[PDB]
């Protein structure tokens with residue numbers, strides 16, 4: 502008994518319209534560069550794209566990126582979403598400038614733009630998510646716990662139709678930002694200061710000396726002498742031997758990681774959506790840098 506959500510292109514819009522929205526996001530990312538101690542809005546936008554998509558349930562096609570339901574009270578007030586209001590607030594003037602783009606399209610695009618502007622891989626992106634009403638908003642509790650093991654992570658991701666390679670690729674987005682004690686009960690960055698997407702998540706897991714410590718919220722997290730941290734679920738990826746092999750593969754091949762992340766992150770953002778046979782192809786946006794902007 503799955504819902505069907507057919508992508509419907511915003512009327513009359515083409516690649517050049519979405520490139521403009523991409524440019525607006527990217528220009529503001531450049532501009533509001535002080536946010537979160539000069540980290541900027543990139544990681545919170547990537548987290549917003551993931552959380553608005555990762556409520557999906559493959560079994561009945563509820564949740565997912567299609568409806569743009571984060572805009573409603575129940576979803577924005579999810580404890581799992583604590584802090585994401587910042588990303589929503591970043592995107593408000595973009596929505597105000599381009600009132601024609603659906604919410605789900607703007608949520609998902611914000612993540613694609615962040616990744617790409619941080620010099621991550623090109624993520625192909627398709628339009629046509631259509632806003633759905635308040636009673637389509639998924640219930641809280643569909644996003645994953647951080648305090649769990651490899652078995653939990655494996656099972657969890659099966660609901661999002663993600664296999665081991667995809668799960669390991671996705672998680673490497675943790676290299677981007679940091680946990681904030683007030684949002685999640687975890688504190689610190691996964692890696693070095695940076696304004697670039699890399700494969701450092703996998704390098705850190707493997708090369709840092711990790712100690713299992715209690716943070717100020719009385720929760721365990723793996724801490725390193727460099728000031729980095731790993732969630733129990735992150736650390737689970739080197740405790741499970743199947744995960745471990747993939748961690749090593751990406752730690753040793755930046756291009757492989759980029760390609761697999763791009764594919765998985767696009768799949769994540771597209772789960773639950775039926776695209777017509779005559780839907781446009783995915784768009785690959787140029788970065789500001791490739792445009793000389």
Ligand code: HEM
Nearest residue numbers: 544547548551645646647671674678679680681684685734
């Ligand atoms: C088992 C899976 C996962 C768990 C338990 C988890 C949990 C968390 C937690 C607790 C935070 C810190 C929240 C805060 O305090 O601000 C965080 C941040 C973040 N997450 Fe994950 N996450 C998971 C998977 C993913 C995936 C699949 C992606 C995207 C591909 C992702 C992207 C991010 C990013 C970019 C941040 C940094 C946000 C910021 O710097 O403000 N995570 N995650």
Ligand SMILES: COc1ccccc1O
Nearest residue numbers: 572589592593596604607
């Ligand atoms: C409901 O309006 C919005 C949708 C997506 C991003 C920012 C907004 O203000």
